Write a protein that binds this ligand. Structure first.
Ligand SMILES: Nc1ncnc2c1ncn2[C@@H]1O[C@H](COP(=O)(O)OP(=O)(O)NP(=O)(O)O)[C@@H](O)[C@H]1O
Ligand SMILES: [Mg+2]
Lengths: 372, 39, 576
């Protein structure tokens, strides 16, 4: 069943709808919510319930036609249907899509010097300062290899990143910018716009007064990136559910009529406000923010953003803004290169183990001397 | 030279069909066994 | 040669006398001659087991049928209703050759195929597949009563299966199909089961569809041939299992084989092992029933692998359920009432504790349930039933399960300056229903940090996609299912004076500190733990060693409840 698209509906009118019929190789190529162009013919279909045949009988403010032998003393009526012969939207895949130009570009990128900074500049050209944040958020896109232990338990792949800052400054820009760049990503907030919110919920379906699930933001963001704004202010119901979703990458439900396990495999980038709006530069992050220790311990990286009214900096920011309004690598190069890079699965070397265990031991004894 | 090397290491790191594959394998076994039985 | 397909469809070809006789002889000879890698005859053993238990149903594996007689394996999915008929006729006379009197018990035998390679998803079926043998998976939602069907009369039952939740994409809807169960397949399943179904895909006319759509469109169904969930141990299995029990160090091998990738934490592995095997229920004099199961609770600091242990227990055991905190309701835990969709009457249905039955029920974030939801499990944990009286219904249901739970200390970290009760915030009627209680804490020894970190780094390089020695996990799974089904420990005698003296002294001290109150339940708990240790050694009778093991576990877990400064005096008081 299809409906008039938002562009066609004449003002004040109710939408019209039509029944479309698909056959053979075209079947199950369109899902509810999709917008597509169909090619075919308009046809007329009779009321089959009032015809009679040697094989099967008839079943039984307008009138139909009369006077056919097969119709007896009943009357026959028609309706309109559209028979569509075609429908279209309105590892090997990389080898198929990349021409020699794309291969040369990813090779040049692989051989590039200070590629890290070049990609930071290319992906975040509008941003000023704050290189550490740019390096951190850039690494999140490359993820980490997931592993399954022999007894069947599994080890987490995605990293999670958190940014805290004053409402006047940069933290919102990163979220909306990476969301505009990235494929298959979701933007939302702790003050969510639906009954489901950040994780699945149960609703009663009035077609049977039967209980069914409804997806939250972290279910839809499966196999993608999730951006959450104003994370310091969030519902308790979701906050408990997030404990499992952050590490186990799954959601579990057990209520009347519904019992299920749902996937939530996602990289989260969270943005939050400190208490009293401006960050107290004299105090730790843990004193400044609203989050509890169990949630806070989940993230792999943390960053702080806070303003001060330096005249030259303000003047430079203003000139940048007005100049932008007055007007190395493209985003598609970054996309193609990122999809190329994510096929590698590097191992750790034997010698790297000694450095890793040493650094962790150094960190642990430092913590013990003045938790990790 | 080096572009093909990059492709090579990249690849190093990287209805009805099942019944047809099964038929192909079993038919190969049939052909072999009937040949051996025939001789 | 049978392979000579010329001028005929395969359905017509196997209808011919020559091909029918060749197929018949080939399957019969395969049954008599098939050998395992050891040179053992496979089907002599399997037929003899079928006859001894009067079961009248023979299972064949597709893989080795193909490996030895590929021509039949090639025809089988293309014309199932023909080759399966010939197979039934061939198997009955082998059975009568071995057991000439077996026609007194039954006059027909059904061959059932298994491990068919060409699995299909429940929404990828097309007209390409009609009248062929297929394999799919899903969860049962509707299931008729068993009814008799004309043929003579035989049992008949109809079911509806749909895609497993969480295998559909997020926010969209599942597909479903109907299936038919005949003869010995009825009551092979019940609602909420997840199953693997092998059958024939079949279609027929229906006037309702033609009048609803306006086009000549048919209805379809699956004829079941083999059904299995996603004991049958061989002689070699029981031989290896029993031989392993000779080892004086078998306790170390079993304990060291639980959640193998987790470093350290000996006490947790030991406690979970005893809870996995379990004590035995009993009813002395018929009027005084008592439960067999052993419940466990874990509590302590964050980042200490508490959530990981439950996931391992979920994987190794069978009939397991997992649930978290705010994600569960009182009604969902026990049982619920509804206006039935098609019978149009009030009906009662099973919740988690009923659906688990003789299995494991795993709970996580137990600290964060609503208190009105957490108090729903009190009857099921001790009386092992669920009693309901609503909407004109008055009944009771079985709840014969083991509960395992994980929690956090108040304020996020455990303080050794305070007792367990002061740090956990749960009331006495809850605390007293758990048989084993554990406390897990952070430590700061540099050598222990280095060993743990080196082990974790080693684990990561080991599992890249690419004490004593533990068992393989499949061997352990075979061991557990044997021990729970073939051994039933008897408590023929034990020292009453020793236990009574120790219990009275222990209870007196429990009154002094108040870390946990000690009650009659503790004695009965030690009896359960003693039987569990006896079962791990595959012994029919409890002995002195078992009682000493039970007392050690009880007292070791009790000393941890106390304040740090008190523990030394308490430990010296209860010297063992
Ligand atoms: N001793 C250990 N050996 C191996 N992995 C460990 C160990 N301790 C912690 N981990 C890892 O730490 C992560 C968190 O494990 P988890 O079971 O959730 O700990 P936890 O104490 O239950 N965390 P929480 O639920 O917040 O209290 C997992 O990836 C574990 O595999
Ligand atoms: Mg945990």
């Amino acid at each position: 069943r299809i409906q008039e698209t938002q562009a066609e509906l004449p003002r004040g009118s109710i939408p019209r709808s039509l029944e479309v019929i698909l056959r053979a190789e075209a079947v199950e190529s369109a899902q509810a919510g999709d917008k597509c162009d169909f090619t075919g013919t308009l046809i007329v279909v009779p009321d089959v319930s009032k015809l009679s045949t040697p094989g099967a009988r008839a079943e039984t403010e307008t009138e139909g036609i009369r006077g056919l032998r097969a119709l007896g003393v009943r009357d026959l009526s028609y309706r309109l249907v559209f028979l569509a012969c075609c429908v279209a939207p309105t590892a090997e895949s990389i080898k198929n899509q990349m021409t020699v130009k794309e291969w040369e570009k990813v090779f040049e990128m692989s051989q590039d010097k200070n590629l890290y900074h070049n990609l930071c500049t290319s992906l975040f050209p509008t941003i000023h300062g704050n290189d550490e944040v740019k390096r951190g958020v850039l690494l999140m896109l490359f993820g980490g290899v997931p592993k399954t232990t022999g007894e069947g338990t599994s080890l987490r792949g995605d990293i999670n990143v958190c940014i805290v800052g004053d409402p006047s400054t940069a933290k919102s820009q990163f979220l909306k910018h990476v969301e505009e760049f990235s494929p298959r990503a979701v933007y939302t907030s702790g003050k969510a716009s639906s009954a489901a919110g950040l994780t699945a919920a149960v609703v009663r379906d009035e077609e049977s007064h039967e209980f069914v699930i409804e997806a939250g933001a972290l279910m839809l963001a499966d196999n993608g990136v999730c951006c959450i704004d104003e994370f310091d202010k969030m519902d308790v119901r979701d906050q408990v559910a997030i404990h499992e979703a952050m590490e186990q990458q799954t959601i579990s439900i057990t209520k009347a009529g519904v019992k299920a396990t749902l996937n939530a495999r996602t990289s989260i980038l969270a943005a939050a406000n400190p208490i009293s709006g401006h960050y107290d530069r004299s105090k730790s992050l843990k004193q400044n923010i609203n989050l509890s220790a169990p949630i806070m311990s989940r993230f792999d990286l943390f960053f702080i953003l806070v303003d001060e009214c330096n005249e030259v900096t303000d003047y430079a920011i203003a000139r940048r803004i007005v100049d932008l309004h007055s007007r190395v690598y493209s985003l598609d190069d970054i996309r193609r290169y990122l999809l190329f890079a994510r096929q590698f699965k590097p191992k750790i070397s034997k010698e790297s183990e000694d450095f890793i265990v040493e650094q962790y031991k150094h960190l642990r004894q430092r913590d013990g001397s003045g938790r990790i | 030279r080096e572009l093909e090397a990059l492709k090579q290491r990249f690849w190093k790191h990287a209805p009805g069909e099942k019944l047809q594959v099964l038929k192909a394998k079993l038919q190969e076994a049939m052909k072999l066994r009937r040949f051996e039985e025939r001789q | 040669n049978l392979e000579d397909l010329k001028g005929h469809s395969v359905r017509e070809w196997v209808s011919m006398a020559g091909p029918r006789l060749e197929i018949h002889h080939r399957f019969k000879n395969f049954l008599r001659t098939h050998v395992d890698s050891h040179g053992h005859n496979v089907f002599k053993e399997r037929i003899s087991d079928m006859c001894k238990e009067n079961r009248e149903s023979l299972v064949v594996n597709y893989e080795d049928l193909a490996a030895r007689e590929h021509v039949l394996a090639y025809f089988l999915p293309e014309a199932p209703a023909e080759l399966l008929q010939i197979f039934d006729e061939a198997a009955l006379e082998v059975v009568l050759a071995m057991y000439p009197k077996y026609d007194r018990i039954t006059n027909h035998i059904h061959v059932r195929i298994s491990h068919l390679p060409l699995v299909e998803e429940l929404r990828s079926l097309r007209q390409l597949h009609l009248n062929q043998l297929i394999r799919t998976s899903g969860v049962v939602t509707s299931c008729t009563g068993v009814l008799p069907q004309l043929s003579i009369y035989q049992n008949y039952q109809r079911i509806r299966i749909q895609e497993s939740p969480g295998k559909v994409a997020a926010g969209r809807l599942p597909r479903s199909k109907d299936a038919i169960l005949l003869a010995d397949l009825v009551d092979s399943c019940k609602p909420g089961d997840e199953i693997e179904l092998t059958g024939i895909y079949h279609n027929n006319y229906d006037g309702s569809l033609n009048t609803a759509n306006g086009f000549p469109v048919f209805a379809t169904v699956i004829l079941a041939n083999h059904v299995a969930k996603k004991g049958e141990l061989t002689d070699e299995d029981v031989k290896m299992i029993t031989s392993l029990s000779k080892d004086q160090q078998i306790g170390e091998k079993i304990f060291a084989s639980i959640a193998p990738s987790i470093y350290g934490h000996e006490d947790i592995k030991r406690g979970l092992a005893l809870a996995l095997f379990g004590g035995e229920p009993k009813n002395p004099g018929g009027k005084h029933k008592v439960r067999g199961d052993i419940n466990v609770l874990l509590c302590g600091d964050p980042g200490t692998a508490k959530s990981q242990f439950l996931k391992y227990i979920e994987k190794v055991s069978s009939r397991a359920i997992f649930t978290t905190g705010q994600g569960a309701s009182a009604v969902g835990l026990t049982a619920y009432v509804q206006r039935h969709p098609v019978s149009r009457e009030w009906t009662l249905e099973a919740g988690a504790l009923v659906l688990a039955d003789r299995g494991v029920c795993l709970i996580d974030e137990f600290d964060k349930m609503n208190d009105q939801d957490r108090t729903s499990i009190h009857e099921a944990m001790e009386q092992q039933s669920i009693s309901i009286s609503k909407a004109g219904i008055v009944t009771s249901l079985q709840a014969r399960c083991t509960v395992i739970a994980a929690a956090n200390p108040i304020g996020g970290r455990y303080d050794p300056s305070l007792t367990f009760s002061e740090n956990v915030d749960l009331t006495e009627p809850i605390i007293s229903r758990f048989d084993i209680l554990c406390v897990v804490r952070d430590t700061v020894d540099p050598v222990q940090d280095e060993m743990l970190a080196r082990f974790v780094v080693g684990s990561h390089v080991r599992h890249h996609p690419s004490g004593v020695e533990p068992l393989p996990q499949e061997v352990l799974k075979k061991y557990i299912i044997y021990a729970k089904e073939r051994v039933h420990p008897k408590l023929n005698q034990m020292d009453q004076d020793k236990v009574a003296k120790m219990y009275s002294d222990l209870r007196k001290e429990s009154m002094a500190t108040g870390s946990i109150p000690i009650t009659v339940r503790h004695i009965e708990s030690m009896i359960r733990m003693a039987e569990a240790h006896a079962r791990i050694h595959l012994r029919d009778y409890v002995i002195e060693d078992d009682v000493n093991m039970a007392i050690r576990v009880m007292l070791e877990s009790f000393i941890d409840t106390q304040k740090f400064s008190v523990m030394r005096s308490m430990r010296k008081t209860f010297a063992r």
